[PDB]
Amino acid sequence: MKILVTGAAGFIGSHLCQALLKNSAYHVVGIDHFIGPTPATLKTGNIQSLELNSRFQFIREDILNTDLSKLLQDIDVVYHLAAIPGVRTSWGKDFQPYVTNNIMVTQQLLEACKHIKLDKFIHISTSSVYGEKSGAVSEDLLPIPLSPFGVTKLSGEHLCHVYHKNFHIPIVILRYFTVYGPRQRPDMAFHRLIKQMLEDKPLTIFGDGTQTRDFTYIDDCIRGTVAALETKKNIIGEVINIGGKEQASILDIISMLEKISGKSATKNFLKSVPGEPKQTWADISKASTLLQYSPTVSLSDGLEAEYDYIKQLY
Amino acid sequence: MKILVTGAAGFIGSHLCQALLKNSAYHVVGIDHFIGPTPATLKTGNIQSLELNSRFQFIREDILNTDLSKLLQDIDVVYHLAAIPGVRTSWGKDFQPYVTNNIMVTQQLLEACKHIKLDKFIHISTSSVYGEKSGAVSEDLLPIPLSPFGVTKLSGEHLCHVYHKNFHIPIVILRYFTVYGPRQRPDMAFHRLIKQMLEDKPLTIFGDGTQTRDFTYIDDCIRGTVAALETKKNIIGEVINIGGKEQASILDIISMLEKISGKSATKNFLKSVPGEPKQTWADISKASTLLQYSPTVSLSDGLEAEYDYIKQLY
Numbered sequence: 001m002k003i004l005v006t007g008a009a010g011f012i013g014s015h016l017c018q019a020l021l022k023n024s025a026y027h028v029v030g031i032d033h034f035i036g037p038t039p040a041t042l043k044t045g046n047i048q049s050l051e052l053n054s055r056f057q058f059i060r061e062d063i064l065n066t067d068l069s070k071l072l073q074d075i076d077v078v079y080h081l082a083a084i085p086g087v088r089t090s091w092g093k094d095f096q097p098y099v100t101n102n103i104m105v106t107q108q109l110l111e112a113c114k115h116i117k118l119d120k121f122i123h124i125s126t127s128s129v130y131g132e133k134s135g136a137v138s139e140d141l142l143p144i145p146l147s148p149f150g151v152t153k154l155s156g157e158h159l160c161h162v163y164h165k166n167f168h169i170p171i172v173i174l175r176y177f178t179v180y181g182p183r184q185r186p187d188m189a190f191h192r193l194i195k196q197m198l199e200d201k202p203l204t205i206f207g208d209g210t211q212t213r214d215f216t217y218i219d220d221c222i223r224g225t226v227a228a229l230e231t232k233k234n235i236i237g238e239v240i241n242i243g244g245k246e247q248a249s250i251l252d253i254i255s256m257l258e259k260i261s262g263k264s265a266t267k268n269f270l271k272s273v274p275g276e277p278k279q280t281w282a283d284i285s286k287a288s289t290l291l292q293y294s295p296t297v298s299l300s301d302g303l304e305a306e307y308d309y310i311k312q313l314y
Numbered sequence: 315m316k317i318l319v320t321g322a323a324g325f326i327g328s329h330l331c332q333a334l335l336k337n338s339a340y341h342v343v344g345i346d347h348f349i350g351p352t353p354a355t356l357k358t359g360n361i362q363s364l365e366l367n368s369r370f371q372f373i374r375e376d377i378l379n380t381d382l383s384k385l386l387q388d389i390d391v392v393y394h395l396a397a398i399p400g401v402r403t404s405w406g407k408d409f410q411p412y413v414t415n416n417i418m419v420t421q422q423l424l425e426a427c428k429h430i431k432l433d434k435f436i437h438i439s440t441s442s443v444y445g446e447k448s449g450a451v452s453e454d455l456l457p458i459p460l461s462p463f464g465v466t467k468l469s470g471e472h473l474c475h476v477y478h479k480n481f482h483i484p485i486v487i488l489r490y491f492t493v494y495g496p497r498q499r500p501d502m503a504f505h506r507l508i509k510q511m512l513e514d515k516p517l518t519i520f521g522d523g524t525q526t527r528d529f530t531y532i533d534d535c536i537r538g539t540v541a542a543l544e545t546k547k548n549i550i551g552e553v554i555n556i557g558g559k560e561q562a563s564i565l566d567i568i569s570m571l572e573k574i575s576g577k578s579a580t581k582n583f584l585k586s587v588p589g590e591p592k593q594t595w596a597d598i599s600k601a602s603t604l605l606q607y608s609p610t611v612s613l614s615d616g617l618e619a620e621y622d623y624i625k626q627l628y
């Protein structure tokens with residue numbers, strides 16, 4: 001059967017495509033415009049990996065400049081990953097690209113899916129929609145984003161609900177929690193901290209380093225994402241958290257990188273960035289039930305894999 | 315103080331400016347680009363009186379193409395009513411203006427308000443953020459909009475929370491429920507049904523006419539809205555429902571119009587419009603507690619006032 005992956009040249013999109021292409025039953029179309037925080041050179045590598053496989057078709061186009069009706073005629077499943085993802089660069093003059101690529105892009109894709117016979121429209125969202133909450137967050141918690149970025153992603157979720165209720169588009173929303181591993185975007189914490197450690201530079205810590213994340217290793221994220229397609233259960237209309245094996249503070253991660261590198265870190269403490277929560281912590285009860293999701297990669301093993309990728313990247 | 319009213323030439327904004335100008339201590343700056351569903355001719359009629367007043371400055375400019383430094387200089391209070399408000403016309407190509415005028419406008423005003431010291435930023439939102447709910451809805455309910463329009467308004471609310479939590483912008487959110495009376499927009503039900511009855515044309519009913527709304531008379535709406543500025547108590551960060559004296563069905567309303575006109579309605583029943591709930595019903599206990607809000611205008615009195623306005627208009 002035939003799967004559209006939007007944002008296929010990106011971090012998570014390229015891994016998702018690779019996993020789907022392991023199944024000879026699946027044909028994959030990737031669409032990507034090469035925009036956002038990751039320079040075009042690293043995305044070119046991603047698409048090169050995918051184009052090794054005869055069952056992959058690459059479309060280098062803006063979704064807002066694509067004949068979506070024609071693109072979707074033979075598509076059975078949409079994975080929608082295309083977005084501008086940076087929590088920290090969504091203020092003032094930088095906000096318009098988030099609205100265009102996170103809101104207008106999602107609305108246009110849904111409009112085009114109204115008269116398609118889809119199995120599933122699997123929309124990728126973010127723990128960023130919740131904002132600041134205590135305890136492990138469940139998917140029925142009133143979300144209040146802290147950043148303009150989070151507002152745009154939550155607007156994308158709400159459009160999914162509008163088109164599902166009015167036009168029976170078979171939507172599934174996955175909320176990922178801080179994904180890491182090989183090919184992680186260069187703007188994210190682990191990529192930056194690892195690169196700084198490799199180059200004997202001070203490690204840049206925003207705030208006091210006590211902020212915590214439910215870090216999700218890429219292979220765990222992708223197992224849950226493929227399960228959203230393959231699950232025996234009816235998940236149409238569900239929001240599902242996809243979170244990681246182990247929660248950690250940035251200080252905890254720095255100690256873990258010291259253990260892997262065998263270097264001691266010089267720390268550069270900078271002012272906290274507006275719009276970032278102090279804690280993320282997913283309740284993955286629902287994923288366990290509906291997807292058989294269980295994250296299995298420990299932070300030590302995951303960080304070592306990313307450490308090896310960074311060391312080879314540069 | 316000096317009070318900025320965005321959307322000052324519209325249905326609710328024109329009434330709000332007139333009510334503020336009754337107090338000799340208020341100066342009002344109104345901005346309006348004369349867009350959305352109401353033709354410019356009716357808007358000119360909305361503000362003719364206001365412009366004459368020496369404590370009212372009117373600016374006919376797009377908020378996204380204006381010097382917001384000039385606009386916000388020494389402003390103590392912002393009433394943000396500017397919006398594209400049509401529930402039923404926010405699909406397909408018509409979606410872009412809702413994004414521009416409901417999301418980008420709100421973000422640019424909040425960005426401009428960062429380094430000025432407001433008493434209050436009173437953001438007007440809509441019962442359409444709730445979607446399809448049963449019983450009288452309270453402000454703590456998880457909102458799931460049914461329409462692209464309702465998504466864009468809920469995104470504007472979320473931007474208010476982001477700028478409040480990060481930059482201490484003193485936001486207050488008012489959620490109005492189906493406002494009617496003199497100067498009601500020509501796309502709304504009462505304006506359309508009264509114009510049709512006046513012209514001896516068939517009355518257009520979407521679905522079977524058993525849908526109900528919490529109809530809020532304009533004078534009740536404005537009393538609640540002015541109460542949000544005039545209260546000294548800390549309502550900063552609060553979402554407050556503003557609803558009407560009496561809920562009714564469209565068939566109930568048409569009966570009341572028949573008794574006002576002494577004419578019988580010819581009825582055309584059309585398909586239900588995607589994106590509209592079957593019922594709205596406000597819990598106004600929070601407005602009662604925070605604003606001493608109590609709606610006092612009955613539908614028979616309110617409809618006779620609108621009927622009189624519509625007859626005179628045409």
Ligand SMILES: NC(=O)c1ccc[n+]([C@@H]2O[C@H](COP(=O)([O-])OP(=O)(O)OC[C@H]3O[C@@H](n4cnc5c(N)ncnc54)[C@H](O)[C@@H]3O)[C@@H](O)[C@H]2O)c1
Pocket residue numbers: 006007008009010011012013031032033034035036037038043061062063064080081082083084085101105124125126127153175176177178179180185
């Ligand atoms: N990386 C994480 O930690 C994380 C966590 C939560 C959720 N997510 C979500 O996962 C998805 C993928 O994130 P990522 O880290 O791989 O980001 P990324 O920037 O690596 O990949 C997204 C891709 O989308 C593409 N794109 C954007 N707008 C487009 C448009 N208009 N037309 C075509 N292509 C377009 C970009 O070119 C980019 O390659 C996003 O929706 C993101 O919000 C990521």
Ligand SMILES: NC(=O)c1ccc[n+]([C@@H]2O[C@H](COP(=O)([O-])OP(=O)(O)OC[C@H]3O[C@@H](n4cnc5c(N)ncnc54)[C@H](O)[C@@H]3O)[C@@H](O)[C@H]2O)c1
Pocket residue numbers: 320321322323324325326327345346347348349350351352357375376377378394395396397398399415419438439440441467489490491492493494499
């Ligand atoms: N009428 C109702 O029943 C109702 C109920 C719930 C909430 N609301 C909200 O109340 C507010 C006022 O609604 P209304 O019925 O008076 O609508 P309206 O269309 O009469 O007034 C809104 C005004 O905003 C102006 N405007 C829009 N975009 C602008 C921009 N970029 N720059 C400058 N001016 C701009 C328009 O020209 C218009 O006159 C809106 O926010 C609406 O969503 C209305």
Ligand SMILES: O=C(O)[C@H]1O[C@H](OP(=O)(O)OP(=O)(O)OC[C@H]2O[C@@H](n3ccc(=O)[nH]c3=O)[C@H](O)[C@@H]2O)[C@H](O)[C@@H](O)[C@@H]1F
Pocket residue numbers: 085086087126127128129176177178179187188189190192193204205206207211213250273276
């Ligand atoms: O799940 C989510 O909500 C989001 O996951 C990622 O964002 P995060 O900001 O949580 O991840 P990342 O950039 O690794 O930052 C993690 C923490 O690390 C801190 N940090 C980041 C970079 C750095 O150099 N130093 C640093 O201390 C940040 O302030 C933050 O507290 C993704 O970047 C984002 O796309 C996604 F939406």
Ligand SMILES: O=C(O)[C@H]1O[C@H](OP(=O)(O)OP(=O)(O)OC[C@H]2O[C@@H](n3ccc(=O)[nH]c3=O)[C@H](O)[C@@H]2O)[C@H](O)[C@@H](O)[C@@H]1F
Pocket residue numbers: 399400401440441442443490491492493501502503504506507518519520521523525527564587590591594
């Ligand atoms: O309370 C709110 O949040 C919303 O109130 C209004 O929207 P509504 O659609 O409830 O009001 P209006 O347009 O008067 O419609 C009332 C009912 O009347 C029905 N209707 C409308 C027009 C018509 O010609 N015939 C008709 O049956 C509609 O289907 C709806 O069920 C405002 O138009 C909208 O701006 C606001 F968001």
